[PDB]
Design a protein around this nucleic acid. Sequence first.
DNA 1: GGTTGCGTGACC
DNA 2: GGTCACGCAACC
Lengths: 176, 174
Amino acid sequence: NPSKRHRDRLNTELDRLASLLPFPQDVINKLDKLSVLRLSVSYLRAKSFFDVALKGLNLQEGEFLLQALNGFVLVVTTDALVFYASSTIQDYLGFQQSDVIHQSVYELIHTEDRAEFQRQLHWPPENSPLMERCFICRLRCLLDSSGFLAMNFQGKLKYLHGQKPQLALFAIATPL
Amino acid sequence: DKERLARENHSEIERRRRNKMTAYITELSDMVPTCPDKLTILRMAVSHMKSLRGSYKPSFLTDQELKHLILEAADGFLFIVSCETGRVVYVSDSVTPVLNQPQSEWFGSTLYDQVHPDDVDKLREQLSTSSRRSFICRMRCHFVVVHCTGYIKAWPDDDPEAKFCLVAIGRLQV
DNA sequence: GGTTGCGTGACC
DNA sequence: GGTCACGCAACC
Ligand SMILES: [Er+3]
Ligand SMILES: [Er+3]
Ligand SMILES: [Er+3]
Ligand SMILES: [Er+3]
Ligand SMILES: [Er+3]
Ligand SMILES: [Er+3]
Ligand SMILES: [Er+3]
């Protein structure tokens, strides 16, 4: 039929796109078709924002940055959606970044601390003295933990561009 | 015998799959060279992706994007130093907003020269090499409190195991 | 022949 | 609770 070709050639592009994503093959192949799109736009959003803001070991640098840090990096929006979760989130919380991005941050936070976090999202010029955030919060953990691993977000909330003028929390997770 | 209702709630669910599907296409059409057929938007999206880009490491974010990000959220800079001889191996350009004097008196100088005198003895203890080390020290420009976190990697994928070096990042303590 | 949406069912 | 694949009725 012609509808079967419709859906088919509509799928092959999702498969190619997925294969182009910047994750290990282990996770790429188990990606839900919706996830493909969702995170695939998360990628482009990050690239745009970094192009506007940023407008041989230099390569090894990134890798070194992820491992050398005692925790992981988090970028959330006022919509309370993980704009970014570094690969190392798996190393301390047992979550794969693939399934953390573009998912309600509140699905990682303890109910008690959920409120305080919601307050940390919303308090403003670019680099004010205000809205420097350094708060403690407990985040779900999947390691052998008792769930709710306690750690400490030290970060600097700043304006998020490239999306369409919303704010966002850019922070580091310090486990201790 | 009203199961049709609960199967009518099934419709509502499958519907959101569309909205979520379509809504992403629109989202995925705002990060592309356009303001249209969806399929076309997906082919153009593939094109965009391929334009952006043995063992090889993919990355959501490049070294510039991480370097920057860490430098924004925490005021952290990377440095690799030699695990015994106080010899610096590498320092990112992020040593300019955190501290000053980038890439001159840090380029070939010993890490012991960049710290306090009364911290040398407390530092060599970290570099015994007798897997992951973290500490705090006082760094030059007069002086600031720097929290250093990192791991040990050697400098010359196996099945069992791999002069060493301290690969760490230092950020202003708080 | 194209694509946009809709209500079903099987299969988890 | 959700995914994936049908087939259908529209319409350029
Ligand atoms: Er899903
Ligand atoms: Er790199
Ligand atoms: Er309690
Ligand atoms: Er029935
Ligand atoms: Er700062
Ligand atoms: Er000097
Ligand atoms: Er081997």
